[PDB]
Amino acid sequence: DDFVMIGSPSDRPFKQRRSFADRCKEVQQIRDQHPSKIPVIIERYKGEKQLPVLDKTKFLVPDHVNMSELVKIIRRRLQLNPTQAFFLLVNQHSMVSVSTPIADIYEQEKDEDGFLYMVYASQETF
C-alpha cells in the first residue's frame, strides 16, 4: 500500500536540498555581491542529543572573523546557557585554529561547491 514516510524534505542536509551546480552558482553570485564575506553552512550533527536546532543555517561572515568569534555568534543564536558544552567543527570534523581568519580557513577547508561547511555538536566527533 502507501509508504510510511520517515522524515521530511526540509530535514535533508543543504547539499541534498540544492543541486551542486546551483550551490556553485550561489557562491559565485554571493562573492561578486559580497567580496569580503565567506559563505558558511552551519548544521547540527546528525547524532546530537543535547543541543537545540539552528533554524537558519547559511551565514555570510567577514573575511577577518575568527572561529572564536563565530562560535560566540552561534552560541548566541542557539540561546545557550554558558555551561552548555558546544563545539563548532569544520569540513571533516576538523578542529581548526581559533585565531586564523575565516578567509584563510576557507581556502584550506571549503567544499568543491565553494561553501565552507561546519557541524556543531556537544562533543568532538570524531
Binding site for its own copies (CB under 8 A): 45-50, 67-68, 71-72, 75, 80-88, 92-100, 121-126
Nearer to its own copies, 16 or 81 (CB): 81
Q: Which amino acid would we find at residue 84?
A: Q
Q: Bridge-partner residues for 118, per DSSP? A: 42, 90
Shortest Cβ distance from residue 104 to its own copies (Å)? 11
User: What minimum distance in Å lies between the beta carbon of 103 and its own copies?
Assistant: 16
Instruction: Beginning with the edge strand found earlier in the chain, give each strand of the sheet holding 87-90 in spatial order.
Output: 58-62, 37-44, 116-121, 87-90
Q: Which residue, 64 or 93, is less far from its own copies as judged by CB?
A: 93
Closest by CA position to 23, among listed 114, 126, 120, 86: 114
User: Least separation, in Å, of the C-beta of 48 and its own copies?
Assistant: 6
Q: How many angstroms separate the CA atoms of 95 and 88, rounded?
A: 8
Query: Given the complex with its own copies, which of 29 and 84 has the nearer CB atom?
Result: 84
